[PDB]
Each structure stands twice: as C-alpha cells, then as structure tokens.
Design a binder for this molecule. Structure first.
Ligand SMILES: CC(=O)N[C@H]1[C@H](O[C@@H]2[C@@H](OC[C@H]3O[C@H](O)[C@@H](O)[C@@H](O[C@H]4O[C@H](CO)[C@@H](O)[C@H](O)[C@@H]4O[C@@H]4O[C@H](CO)[C@@H](O)[C@H](O)[C@H]4NC(C)=O)[C@@H]3O)O[C@H](CO)[C@@H](O)[C@@H]2O)O[C@H](CO)[C@@H](O)[C@@H]1O
Ligand SMILES: *[C@@H]1O[C@H](CO)[C@@H](O)[C@H](O)[C@H]1NC(C)=O
Length: 470
C-alpha cells in the first residue's frame, strides 16, 4: 500500500478540528496552503516520490494532554499529510491507548512529556516501539544526559534525560546539536518598509528589564515599536497573522533583548525583510550559568539569543552585538538604517526544504536495523579543547554520529566508557577506544588529547542531509 501525495487540505482540517488547540494552526495552514501545495508538487517533480510505503504514524502531543513547538507540530503534521502517510493524532492518554491498541504503528512522533506517558500507558512493551520514536526536543539532548547510568554518575538531575535512545532520534528546532536530528519548521513569509521603524522582540515587560541604554541608542536613529518599557516606545499591543505580517513587512529592524532563546520569530522577521539585532552572549549561556537552562539535557552553550541566525545567516540580516558595547550597537543600528532590504529564508525553513528533509528521514533514517552512506565519512582530529562538533564545523562539515562505530597509529590502546573517546595522545601514540556505544558524542572537548571525529558533507541550505543522502 503506497503513499500518494495529497494536494487538498479538507481531510487535514477535519482531523485538526477535533482538538481545540489546533484552532490557530488551521488558520496558519490556510494562510500557507498555496505555499504547501506548490511545494509538494515541486518536490514530486524534482525527486521520485513513487514506491514509498504508506506508514501508519502515531503523532502524540504530550504538551496538549510553546508557540514555536505548536508551529513545529503543525508543520510536521502537514508534511506527513502532504506526503500521503496515515496519521493518527493523539492529545490524550485514551487516544494513545486506542491507536497503539490497534497495532500496525510504524513511526511515532512524540515529545519527552508524551514519552513519559507512552512508557506509563503501554507498560514494559513500550520498549518494543523504541526504535520507531522520533522525539521532538527543541533544545536538544546530548549523549551524556541520554545515558541513564552515565548521567547519574555525573550528577545530572535533568528531568528530561536518561531515556537511553539513539540520540539521533531527538528532533531539534534548529541544527544546533549534531548528536541529534534537525526537524525545524516552516517560516511564514521597499516602499512598504519604514526605514526608521524598529520593533522590540518580546511580549512581556519582564523581557525589558535593564535594557534602557540599548533602547536609548536605537531610539537615537529609529522609532522603537513594541507589542507588549521607556515612554518613547510605541506599543501596538498583541497582534497576529496578516496584521503581524504587515507590521514586520513595515519594520526595518527587529530588536532582540536576550530572551526568548532560539525562537521562530527572528526568522519570520528576516523572511519579511527585517534585520535582527541579536544580543551576543559572552560568556555563552548554558545549563551551567543560566536559570532557564538548568535541568535541560545538554551542556550546549548559546553564543547569542539566536545562534542559528548568528552562524547560518549572519550580516546583513543578523547583527550579533554586545548590548553593553554602545559604539558597536550604534554602528549596527546606523548600518541597518542604510541597508538595502533583501528578504531571506534558508532553504531548510521553506515548505519544499522541510518536505525534502522529513521525506528523507521517513524513507532513509532507520534505528530498527546504512544512512548516511559511509561514502560521506570524512575523519578529522579535534585538537585538545576542541569538540567533534567544532572540528567538523571548522572545515564547513557537520559531525555525523552514525559513523563513530567505523572509527572505533596507536603504539598502545585501552577502552573507556566516556563521551570523549575515541581519543589519541599523539605524543605517546596512546589510543583510548569507546567501550559504551551509547556514549559516542559529537559534543565534548578532550582537555589533553585529540578526538578522532566523524564528519560528513552537507547540502548548503539543507545541513540535515549529505550530498548523497536523498
Ligand atoms: C513545549 C516543550 O516541552 N518544549 C521543550 C521544553 O521547554 C520547557 C517546557 O516546560 C514544560 C513544563 O513547564 C512547567 O514546569 C510545568 O507546566 C510542566 O507541567 C508539568 O508540571 C506541572 C507542575 O510543575 C503540572 O501542573 C503539569 O500537570 C505537568 O505535570 C507533569 O505531567 C507529566 C505528564 O504525565 C508527567 O509526566 C510529569 O511527571 C509531571 N511533572 C511534574 C513534575 O509533576 C511542564 O512540563 O515547555 C515550556 C513551555 O511550555 C518551555 O519554556 C520550557 O523551557 O524543554 C525540553 C527540554 O529542553 C524540550 O525537550 C521540549 O521540546
Ligand atoms: C521616520 O520617518 C518617517 C518618514 O521618513 C516620518 O514620518 C517619521 O516622523 C520619522 N520618525 C522620527 C522619529 O523621526
């Protein structure tokens, strides 16, 4: 029974009308419907989408039993629907039991809250389905937090970790954690734009605490608008849809205050021709120094409010600035004021880019027992203090953790259960090899030794996929 692409949303709307929380998701799908339908038709012309098996897919939304996560769920469901899969949407324990009770489930999209429910509801046979799980986890899960016993040994108290999955089963909001898979979402998209209009990113007064100098510098050159705080700020209150599309289409500069971290909104601003003023974090913010991140299953350090925007887009669309550097902020605002407007969206955040990525994952990513192909492997040695993530990135590659097993001249050697191996002491030519295959980790820098690191190429604008991965 083969998957046939769908070009009509009538059935999708009927499914999402069964859950009150999808109300504004259905609205957004209608706004984006022509983009989605154009994209599934264009993909089907570029690539053979024939002879794909129709999968029975459980989509269990633990969080419905977070706007960015609701957007990601909406875009995932829409992608599955367009690709012709048999979607069973669950937002209750009752639904979960019924769907799994019926059997034939081939693929499971769930969040970590939903996974706790899955385990509790199904009992010990929950692990029978473990290889079919794709776990929507916005901020990502590094191997040291996923391995229950290693995490306990290191004193990690995360309520989110210790699931003992293959870490590539965690599906992230941005491609920030190469131990994981990047799922993302779709970003909704010069006489319109008011050259001197800036708009503050942040719907609560709390976000604005101790930003006055920053805002005062911006206010020297631009009107400061808000949707929520100095007297001069022009507040439009809470908005949406066409209205917010208009306000962003009207705005030259979208102003970050530091929070929230890694949201969709800066990408929507850039897609609508805005530049993003992106606060720089020195030191970088992590579960080690930031209350928001304490208990999150990663030590990943954020170098700015939106590191994807900073690293994968950059100027002129994204100015990553020290808020405390008055010279730097003024230079940035004056630059943006004089910039030519260039609306931009990375391919991977388009309808067709997301359809291509999720179709590849559905067809090629299998944890139930080779992809990416071993031809993609390029091995790099991380210097001491450098992670496998870093040394791949430094060569315009990305760490590919599925190649660690193929990397596991050595005068002596030993075995260790540690996220930092395989390692090489090139002084005494001593090799330490991985003794616990669940501890293979792109994340982590050896303090003394070189790390032996598995990298792969990526399609520019589609970092989730190697050139030979389609
Ligand atoms: C959307 C999402 O999950 N996104 C990210 C996530 O982001 C964080 C997350 O926080 C969700 C939690 O927020 C509050 O702490 C609570 O509302 C909590 O709800 C549980 O706990 C409260 C009491 O604290 C209860 O009132 C509520 O019923 C619920 O109880 C819990 O129920 C579950 C289901 O059975 C049970 O399994 C738990 O044991 C039980 N917990 C307790 C202690 O009783 C929320 O869970 O979402 C926020 C926005 O919604 C974000 O800002 C947060 O950063 O982060 C993770 C990890 O990084 C990521 O994987 C995920 O994608
Ligand atoms: C910004 O420019 C527009 C037109 O160029 C004008 O209407 C507006 O008054 C200006 N704002 C400030 C604060 O000077």
């Amino acid at each position: 029974s083969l998957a046939e692409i769908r070009t009509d949303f009538n059935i999708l709307y009927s499914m999402m009308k069964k859950h009150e929380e999808f109300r504004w998701m259905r609205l957004r799908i209608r706004r984006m419907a022509d983009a989605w339908i154009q994209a599934i038709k264009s993909l089907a012309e570029k690539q053979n989408l024939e002879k794909r098996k129709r999968k029975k897919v459980l989509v269990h939304l633990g969080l419905l039993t977070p706007l960015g996560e609701l957007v990601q769920w909406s875009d995932l469901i829409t992608s599955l629907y367009l690709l012709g899969h048999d979607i069973r949407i669950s937002a209750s324990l009752a639904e979960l039991k019924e769907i799994m009770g019926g059997g034939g489930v081939e693929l499971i999209y769930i969040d970590i809250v939903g996974l706790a429910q899955f385990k509790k509801t199904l009992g010990p046979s929950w692990v029978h389905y473990q290889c079919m799980l794709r776990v929507l986890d916005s901020f990502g899960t590094e191997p040291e937090f996923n391995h229950a016993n290693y995490a306990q040994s290191k004193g990690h108290k995360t309520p989110w970790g210790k699931w003992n999955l293959n870490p590539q089963q965690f599906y992230t909001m941005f491609p920030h954690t190469p131990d994981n898979s990047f799922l993302g979402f779709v970003v909704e998209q010069n006489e319109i734009k008011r050259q001197n209009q800036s708009l503050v990113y942040g719907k609560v007064d709390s976000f604005w605490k101790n930003k006055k100098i920053y805002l005062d510098i911006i206010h020297t050159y631009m009107e400061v608008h808000a949707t929520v705080i100095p007297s001069y700020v022009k507040n439009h209150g809470i908005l949406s849809g066409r209205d917010l599309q208009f306000l962003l289409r009207e705005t030259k500069l979208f102003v970050g205050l530091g929070f929230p971290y890694e949201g969709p909104a800066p990408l929507e601003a850039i897609a609508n021709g805005c530049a993003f003023l992106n606060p720089k974090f020195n030191p970088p913010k992590s579960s080690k120094n930031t209350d928001f991140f304490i208990g999150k299953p990663t030590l990943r350090e954020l170098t700015s409010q939106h590191p994807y925007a900073e690293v994968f887009i950059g100027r002129p669309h994204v100015w990553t600035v020290d808020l405390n550097n008055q010279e730097e902020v003024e230079d940035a605002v004056k630059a943006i004021l004089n910039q030519k407007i260039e609306p931009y969206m990375p391919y991977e955040f388009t309808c067709e880019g997301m359809l291509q990525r999720i179709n590849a994952f559905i067809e090629k990513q299998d944890f139930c027992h080779m992809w990416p192909p071993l031809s993609a492997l390029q091995v790099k040695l991380a210097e001491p203090g450098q992670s496998c993530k870093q040394v791949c990135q430094e060569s315009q590659l990305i760490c590919e953790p599925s190649f660690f097993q193929h990397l596991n001249t050595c005068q002596s050697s030993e075995l260790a259960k540690d996220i930092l191996v395989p390692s090489f002491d090139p002084k005494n030519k001593h090799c330490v090899f991985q003794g616990d295959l669940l501890l293979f980790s792109c994340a982590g820098a050896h303090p003394r030794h070189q790390r032996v690191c598995p990298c792969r190429d990526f399609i520019k604008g589609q970092v989730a996929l190697c050139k030979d991965c389609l």
